[model samples]
Target: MQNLDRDVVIVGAGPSGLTAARELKKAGLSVAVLEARDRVGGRTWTDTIDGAMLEIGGQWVSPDQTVLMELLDELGLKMYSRYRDGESVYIGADGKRTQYTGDTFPVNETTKAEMDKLVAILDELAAEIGPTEPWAHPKARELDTISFHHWLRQNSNDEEACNNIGLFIAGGMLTKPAHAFSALQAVLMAASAGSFSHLTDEDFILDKRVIGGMQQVSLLQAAELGDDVVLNSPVRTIKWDENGVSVVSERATVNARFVIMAVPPNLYSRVSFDPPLPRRQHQMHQHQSLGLVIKVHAVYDTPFWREEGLSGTGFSAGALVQEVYDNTNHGDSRGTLVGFVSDEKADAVFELSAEDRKKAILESIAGFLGDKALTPEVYYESDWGSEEWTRGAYASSYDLGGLHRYGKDQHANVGPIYWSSSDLAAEGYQHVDGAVRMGQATAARIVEANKLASVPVAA
Candidate 1:
């Protein structure tokens, strides 16, 4: 207790919390970062399965993620571009598979026209709404009132077109069903990644990979904070009012002038608030839930798909793993293909036994790269589903009308308690880039507030 006094306490040592700690420390403010997991990177976890190293969590960097790019440069980290050579495989709604060399899927002429129109509409909405304050949009409520799926149907009569657009925001981004989240929520996702067009283009959104894995960022952050970053210490309660905050973990108790809740929005309820959170916060949080996805990795002896002039990039709106990418590490001899089993598909896979689920998922991948995918020198599935701390993969989003209705209150600070995460960011939302930006923003905000607060007022 005596050793825990600090300027701020961050509860969650993921990229968000760690960045806040690093920034605050650089400003010469003392900080203690408490993490529930034994490790630092919460969602951006890298681990070894059998003999192969796998980033079973968040990885990937887009050209638009400037903050992360700068940090990678600062940390002296290296990056490798994703393999994009050769044509990509596209599996249509009719179970027809074709290899093509373009961003748009290989669809029928009518469906392609419909898809184009729908994407253009979404692009306009996302550009207008922007990511920072999506709930403040003029038509925010109207858009939020209707589900994404319904909105797509209203705009385009082509069912295949609706499914394709929905795939970008649903199965592709949110990892949820189109009917589960609202149109505004989808727009927010699009806007956060720069615009709807970026979301639709896999080559843009899924671009680069960090050398030594994305988790290295957090590891470097922890290395900087030294012993200040505590591991396996989940904060049990945060008692706060006007004068500072007292953080209680299962292992220790700490006092600080401010506390940053640098965890995922969905996990906010895990810690008990002393005065019980405000009605607005309690209400808003309930609307947020982590979207689920199984990031599957299959390692082969060589890039066999490349030999066939295939890019290893594949998409199937109806397959168990809707998206697959070439995830071969830099300088590694083995060929790694990463796939995603998103949303309801994730739920379905979980219903099966572990072995059966693996087999089913592999067969689905075999749908794209033939029989070679069925066998991997190392096969690993990022089971974020079973993780107690994080219930979903990627990040979280609002359900149905949740976003526009309750989003305004999500970033509001309650006394000494503040919320920060990739979910709350604009430019880098739901990615490691967003996490870094949120942390930097939060730290700067706090530092400015403390400066103003310390000034002697008129007596």
Candidate 2:
């Protein structure tokens, strides 16, 4: 096998790995980025079918995502505002269709009021504890020790309120159940939002892919790195000690001063580590599971929902298609509606063939919008679970007592290796911005440790 050496080795070519590679190279470090996939842009990808652009993986961004915004500005990319003028439809637990006018709904009114109260309480709690030092709060240990579901049960007696709040929290964070996550961790996530509405707004807009797709950004970075990046290289074993770090892949063995493990936790145990990682880190990997959410995009001849006076964005309690949006507004020649399935449904959908999944989605859409939704001219789906490099979409909430053990201790560097993934971020684990921020942060640490020069600020 071929042999290579570098000042730093980065695993995975997603947002985190790409960001680290760019930053490290800018800082004068000889960085090598290894990607198991033939192409870059890890989870972020855009495919065009019949003149429609479909983003199957990571999507959306907000003004609040400072890091992503800054990067966009530097990259000279522009984003379009998500359409939010029309009323949104929600499918209740009873399978009844309800239209939401303005900001509230009749069934969710009480729940919304309770949610407001809960947000205020969490805001107060976060302020008292401070946002930066989440575990330092007086109630930190208590909150961290128990699941959010338990905390809600202890604090609120309203069953409807609890269920609504639980679903909202679970769906937002891409987790299955609220009781599966720690209260303190949940609060920290809220704090990271800087405000409650920012966290809850349905139209928390994002930029459209400027001209080219998100892959353009990764391609630019890879081009700058040149031969430093090795594609189709999957790491099988990682050996590290006082001397340095060595990673063996299918095509080559890479030795470096330090190894940046930017891959997700699901792929952690799959690779063998020499000297072994700390027991806590290993346990963290074993315990944490990726969120089982699949994004689906269907392209049609026209935006039919618009003719029916709909914005095409809707949420459902237990519909096969949990979320839908008008993704065709992004300068695509054809109309496309993007939808997502969550929890067990997402897993089940992944098990079906592309044609079957398309039929299932079309049937579900027909149930919502009548016979016009029978079939789409084009259909596409993404199953992150099936991808060997990315075993799952992103990290999900851990059960009671698992959060504390996983949070602060999971990413601690062992020997000459450093950990960097969106899951390790204090905020926005499932989002692309969070992964980019984590990569930049890890790049800064490596630069500081090696006494490398700072990267030139993006003009």
All models: lDDT? 0.89, 0.71
- The residue-by-residue lDDT of candidate 1 on 155-217, one tens digit each, is 999988888889888989888899999999988988888878888887788889998999999
Candidate number of the best TM-score: 1
Query: Which one wins on lDDT?
Result: 1
How well is each residue in 97-187 modelled by candidate 2, as lDDT tens digits?
Answer: 7666675544656666776677677677656654455765667788888877788778777665565555555655645556667778677
The alpha-carbon deviation from the true structure for residue 218 of candidate 2, after best TM-score superposition, in angstroms, is 2.2
lDDT score at residue 425, model 1, on the 0-100 scale? 90
TM-score per candidate, in order?
Answer: 0.98, 0.89
Clashing pairs in 2: 79-207, 79-208
Clashing pairs in 1: none
Give candidate 1 regions above 4 Å deviation.
Answer: 1-3, 457-459
State the lDDT at 255 in candidate 1.
Answer: 92
